[model samples]
Target: SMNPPPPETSNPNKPKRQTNQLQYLLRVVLKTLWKHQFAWPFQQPVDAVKLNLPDYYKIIKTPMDMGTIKKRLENNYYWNAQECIQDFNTMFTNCYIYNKPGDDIVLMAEALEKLFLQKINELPTE
Candidate 1:
């Protein structure tokens, strides 16, 4: 009887469900960091980024273009902590982020703490 087609044990074509805490963690973290611009900007606008502008004219007055100042401005403009890593693989490559569930748990907790508590210190206390 052809062994009844092996009793239909399981479907070979069915997708095996995959679970990964890191992927979810990366997604949430990216979004969370992306939104942190509300907190990361300084109260005073030094216009730091203006220094990097093309100074073809002799009338420009960008004063922050020296060693540390320009570098800091450029660095901040590039990738401050508030910046999103955007992709999981990119984050993994850079490290300080883990692919484990435990790490994800901690990241979420820290992110929650940052979100709710960190910015309030600057608020006018009652």
Candidate 2:
């Protein structure tokens, strides 16, 4: 049977695929942390994040825009594939946690480090 036509892009609300996955995942992780997770607190059952990107953008925008964050990691902390466990540790550690994205920090941290390594690898060891 001929493969059915791929799902239609008819819905505007459907997220557009990013040409650059790294930047996309970067945002995914940050939003999950800063927007999806961190905050003062929530009182009611809220679906969408009440926080605005501009509110936290100042803090993360730099690392994202200028690669400041990517430079921060080193061989000491290392990514090590997270062993696929962070949220459990995060929730297990703190009960009052607002955003679960904190778990993603470890994964994204590794991503940034790998990128940093790639960038620096371009430079001469001499």
Candidate 3:
């Protein structure tokens, strides 16, 4: 004869299971972005001038603070692609001023594209 099945378990007082898919996605995206190139340096650096001088100046002149932009990028990962695109467009406009002579915005853009691709690659292979 088969062994007796384990008794069904139940917890009447257990709290409801909560699911925040968006939050989960946001965490993954932010983690990936934070670890990407240029993120940490941009966030906190000993010498900010080494990165991109024009961009740094633009960041300082912008109405939005670095903290605000950082927070938005960190917390808005779950947002739709369109929303992300809009935010990126705004950020690029604000930050591109720093891309001056001899600066290769294409390389920066390529790095960002790689980061995005890496993030997408992390998703389950459906």
**lDDT per prediction?**
0.30, 0.28, 0.42
lDDT of 1 by residue, 25-117 (tens): 234433344355332221122232453423212222221112222222323332322222222222222222222445753454355446533
Predicted candidate 3 versus true structure: per-residue lDDT over 1-126, tens digit per residue: 122222112334533231243343346654556566655433332134444343444343432222333454454432344443344444444445545433565456446546755665544321
Clashing pairs in 2: 37-99
Instruction: Kindly report which residue pairs in candidate 1 clash with one another.
Output: none
* Candidate 3: regions farther than 4 A off: 1-25, 44-70, 73-81, 101-106, 117-126
Model 2, 109: alpha-carbon shift in Å? 3.5
TM-score of 3: 0.41
Candidate 2 residues 1-126, lDDT tens each?
A: 122222222344533332232342234432233332322121111212344433332222111221221221111112221311132132222322323444564444444434433433332221
Tell me the TM-score of each prediction against the true structure: 0.19, 0.22, 0.41
Task: Sort the predicted structures by lDDT, highest score first.
Answer: 3, 1, 2
> Sorted on TM-score, highest at the top, how do the candidates line up?
3, 2, 1
Best by lDDT: 3
How many steric clashes between backbone atoms does each model show?
Answer: 0, 1, 2
RMSD vs true structure, all candidates: 23.3, 17.0, 17.4
